[PDB]
Hints:
The structure is cut from a larger assembly and holds chains A (62 residues), B (77 residues), C (44 residues), D (96 residues) and E (93 residues).
Chain A: H1 4-7, H2 10-33, H3 40-59
Helix pairs in contact in A: 2-3
Chain B: E1 12-17, E2 23-28, E3 32-39, E4 44-51, H1 52-73
Antiparallel strand pairs in B: 1-2, 3-4
Chain D: E1 9-12, E2 21-27, E3 32-35, E4 40-45, E5 48-53, E6 56-57, E7 61-64, E8 71-72, E9 74-79, E10 82-87
Chain D binds 4 RNA strands through strand 4, strand 5, strand 6 and strand 9.
Amino acid sequence: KAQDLREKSVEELNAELMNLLREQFNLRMQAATGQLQQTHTLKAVRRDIARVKTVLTEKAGA
Amino acid sequence: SRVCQVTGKRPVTGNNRSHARNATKRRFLPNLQTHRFWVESEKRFVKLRLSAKGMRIIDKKGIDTVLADMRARGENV
Amino acid sequence: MKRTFQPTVLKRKRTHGFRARMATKNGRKVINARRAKGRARLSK
Amino acid sequence: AAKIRRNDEVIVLAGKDKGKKGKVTKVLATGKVIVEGINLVKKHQKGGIVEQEAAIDASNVAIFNAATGKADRIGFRFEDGKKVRFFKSNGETVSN
Amino acid sequence: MITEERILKVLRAPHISEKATMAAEKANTIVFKVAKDATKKEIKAAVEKLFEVEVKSVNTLITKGKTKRQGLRQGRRSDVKKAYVTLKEGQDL
RNA sequence: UUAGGCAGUAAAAGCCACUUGAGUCUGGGAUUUCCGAAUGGGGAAACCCACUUACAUAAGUAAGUAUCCUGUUGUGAAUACAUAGCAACAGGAGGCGAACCGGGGGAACUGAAACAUCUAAGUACCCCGAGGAAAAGAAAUCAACCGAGAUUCCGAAAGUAGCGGCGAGCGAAAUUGGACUAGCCCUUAAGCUUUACACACGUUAGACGAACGGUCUGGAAAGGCCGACGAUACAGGGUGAUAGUCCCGUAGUUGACGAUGUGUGUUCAGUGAAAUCGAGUAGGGCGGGACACGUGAUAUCCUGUCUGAAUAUGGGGGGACCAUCCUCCAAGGCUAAAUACUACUGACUGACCGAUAGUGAACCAGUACCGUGAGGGAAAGGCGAAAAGAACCCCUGUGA
RNA sequence: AACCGACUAAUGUUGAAAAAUUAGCGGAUGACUUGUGGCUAGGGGUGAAAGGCCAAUCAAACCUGGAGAUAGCUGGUUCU
RNA sequence: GUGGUAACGCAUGCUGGACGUAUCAGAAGUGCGAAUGCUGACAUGAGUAACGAUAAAGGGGGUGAAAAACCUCCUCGCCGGAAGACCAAGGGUUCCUGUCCAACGUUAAUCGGGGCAGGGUAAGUCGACCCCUAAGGCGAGGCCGAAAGGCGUAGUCGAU
RNA sequence: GGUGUGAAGUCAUUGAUGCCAUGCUUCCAGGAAAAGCCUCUAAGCUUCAGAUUGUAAGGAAUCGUACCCCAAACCGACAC
């Protein structure tokens, strides 16, 4: 997270995004099934995605 | 509207006044008429809705000056 | 006995609906009035 | 900016537990502190009847000088560029 | 052309229910709670990609949310779109 | 900025952080579904369906696509030219907002102890258009033979002169005391707006911030008693009763990277602007309206209608009209301040209210509820210092 | 018969119902009746005409505003 | 209890739990029994009328704290061009299940269209959307109108 | 409860207000529109693009769908 994302290229940024999105899918499925005890991770992945989408919007154009 | 294109004369409001001095609202309309003015410069007639006073003004100033004035005002002529 | 309120949704909307109010000057006056009053429901 | 902090030995200034020392466990934003072993209240839980600490007003507690063995007031001063608390009497910087 | 971002947003959760269980046991149908926007094509794509199964059919409904009183303040629960996804014979999820 | 934080109801849960990537505060970025002026078209607002162009290969994605006004380019009819038309492009606009402002329209109840002139009233209301103010403004003004010197606002003159079914009522100016003051151009100005360059100058998170013990009463001390101490700080609030010294503050002293605002210059690019000193004008006739002034003996102003000069040797005004005299130069423009208002933001104040009051609304209120709708429109505050909100037992329906 | 209507009576009249019920009664292929959607709006509409009807309201709807109209009338007007 | 001619004053027990306020001045939202006053509360009538079609119940068993009213069984009665079954409209979760019975239900209630929780609505073919248009609406330009607007062409909407 | 397994399953007659029928006959009051659809060409395109017939492959979205409807769930303040 943080400015580390800005070191990464737009391509690899997108690669993170897709990974995060997949992690976020798994956590949804678990949350519903009741397998998810650590609820804290949902807000984490969600905020991590926003960081990436922030950087990607920066890297767009400029 | 009943508005002279040359002068801007529009309907004004006033009173009717009886012998008993009863005031009823009335309007005073401009003596609007339509007249096709041949405009040499543009080799066309231009039909204007204008007051009879407006015509007198076109007789003094000529159509070319009046058309200019109007176009400036944003009249569609 | 037939009472006065014989609802149809379509007639409610076409008379008192938002797009009906917005179509006319005086309708917009009503919406603005209601919006100024603080009315949760501007239209029916 | 806060005179009383968590993990501060304090002496109680007011109430039933006046003159009793304890450690600030928690500082609520309501201006209340919970202090180990101070405003104990018996709570009938559904369980048993269990003694628990109750929040006290922060103004009802004072930092304990320990060296002087008294309550003291706390000022703030800059020391090595960082702001530090100090005891108003001794002048000594509080452990913090 | 359904993107992977779209595929990862479409399926919101599995739907747990006596009816859902019957569907799974009897008719090889998995009931999901899908996104409101989700279309039957997007849902099929998502089920195929994220569970590696072959889908026969997708049936969808929206359940309109219940009004609840909650003391003084009445309020509605949110509309849920569910998707009855029938897997081809032999496929398990 | 700093020890706690993950909004509340609202507990739990899983967590994060602890001297600075915890978090918070301020600012600036990013994201910003759909509806709404709503603008691709449509539409029962929050929905439906497109075209174009790119992309995708499948039946998707993204972007663009309103109308009008102004301008500029093209194209381009009836007839040659041309124009209309059509298209493209650029720049504007549209909606909302409590009041204040200018303008277009404009009542009636009522008063007149009836009522029609008159009044209410150019009010209410409707409409249009602004702006931070607006409007007005630089004498074809007054005055009175002496003089004054744009406009606006305030005090007098004065309920005076007048007007008025001379009823009810309406109501000036000259002149004078103030506030504020500024004039500048059609041979092209002052100002205004922009643009940057400077500089100042303020604002925008904040920081530090004095001095109290003992004893008594009490559940609790801020109270009492005793003795201290601070005060450029005894504003105010909080704390288990009533606190200068417990806390937050206060006085005072400080703080802005960046971002804003302001005022100066110094620039730019505009605007002012109507060009060129004012003719369909002044004046007149008829009808109305405005001026305190109701047509009166009624000057002056505006003009719907019909007319119509002179043009510094000239013209306007000086309350019918004439002479004389004085004064001003209309028919082109721009112009700050003193003035009006406050829905909104901050601070502070109250011989203002304290829950039938004060807002309709202290409370999840323009809510509930009522009504087809416009619209109408409530009631409803207070355990305790702290939930310590009554473990457990007993009656009872594992109730109340 | 349905359906539309509403001539008589009784009940009911703090109703079961702000116009009904029960028994009878008229029309019942027509100037019929009915659904849906349209249009006409207040000195206005609409009326096979009753001043009927225009949301249980009508010799001028309803709402808001002018507006605290006006009320030579009635009521009421608080301690010693 | 006491004082004064009075409005009222003073003292004090109990209650109450934090304010009150002399004196002299100052200012008023300054005094209520009436207004078919206004708001709230609570009476009287009165444990009175009534408990909403005179289609009708009887019994055995069950469950339950409790059963005329719920479940169940056997009988009886009532509707049957409906008091049955569907659909549109209109409503909007009332549907099904579990649980509860305070309030709601004109009684009780174990029951309920009541409370609480959970579940439930699956479409190429039904309907909408959609193509099409009727009445009619809106309406680029346009015509007309103090303004607001009115009318209307091309269009575009509009089902019944 | 579950599954499982299951006989006969014909004929005559009667007979709709349903169907043929948007028919037929007749009458006067003279009986929607528009599209889908068929066909014709125009401008325009002519190894095309298109058209037809066929054969494969794929699609057909989106929204409604519970429940009440001679009603205790709609309109009547009410389980009227």
